[PDB]
C-alpha cells in the first residue's frame, strides 16, 4: 500500500533558542566595523569552500589542489576519477555548443 | 530520498473513482483503469 496509518509525533520548533535568536548578527562586520574583517570570515566549513562558489567540476579541481595531499588513497582515486568524468561531460557533451 | 511523493494514494484514487462501475481488472488496476477512463471521458 505505502501510506502511514497514524499521525507522526508532533514536532515543536523552538524559534527562540540562542542560535535562532542571534542568527545573522555580525553580517555587517565590514560596514559597521571600519572594514577590519570581511563577512566571509564568518564562514566556517571546508578549507576549499570558505568564501568561494563554483560548479561541481570547479569544486573538485579546488579540493584536489588544496587538500589533495592530505586525503585518503581511495578517496583521492575517486576524486581523480570524478574530475576525469566531469571534464568529458562539460567539454564534449550537451545541447549547446 | 531527499524528496519522496507522499500522497500517491490520492492521485490514484482520482482515476479509480471513475473506474468503479467497469467490469474486469480495469475497475481496480490503475495502469489498465486509466486507459479506459480516458476513453470514457
Amino acid at each position: 500500500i505505502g501510506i502511514r496509518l497514524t499521525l507522526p509525533p508532533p514536532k515543536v520548533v523552538d524559534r527562540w533558542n540562542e542560535k535562532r535568536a542571534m542568527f545573522g548578527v555580525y553580517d555587517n562586520i565590514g560596514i559597521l566595523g571600519n572594514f577590519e574583517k570581511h563577512p566571509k570570515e564568518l564562514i566556517r566549513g571546508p578549507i576549499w569552500l570558505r568564501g568561494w562558489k563554483g560548479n561541481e567540476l570547479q569544486r573538485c579541481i579546488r579540493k584536489r589542489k588544496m587538500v589533495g595531499s592530505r586525503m585518503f588513497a581511495d578517496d583521492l582515486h575517486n576524486l581523480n576519477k570524478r574530475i576525469r568524468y566531469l571534464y568529458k561531460h562539460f567539454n564534449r557533451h550537451g545541447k549547446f555548443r | 530520498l531527499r524528496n519522496r511523493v507522499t500522497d500517491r494514494y490520492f492521485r490514484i484514487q482520482e482515476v479509480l473513482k471513475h473506474a468503479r462501475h467497469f467490469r474486469g481488472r480495469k475497475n481496480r488496476c490503475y495502469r489498465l483503469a486509466v486507459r479506459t477512463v480516458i476513453r470514457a471521458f
Binding site: 501510506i3 502511514r4 496509518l5 497514524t6 499521525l7 507522526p8 | 519522496r4 507522499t6 500522497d7 494514494y9 490520492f10
Partner: peptide
C-alpha cells in the same frame, strides 16, 4: 517511513469518512 505530515493527516480524515459509512451514529 516518509517525512511529512500533510499526506498522513489527509489519510486519517479519509479513514474517518469510511468509519462513518460503516456504522452511522444514532
Amino acid at each position: 517511513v516518509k517525512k511529512g505530515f500533510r499526506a498522513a493527516f489527509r489519510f486519517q480524515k479519509e479513514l474517518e469518512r469510511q468509519r462513518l459509512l460503516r456504522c452511522p451514529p444514532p
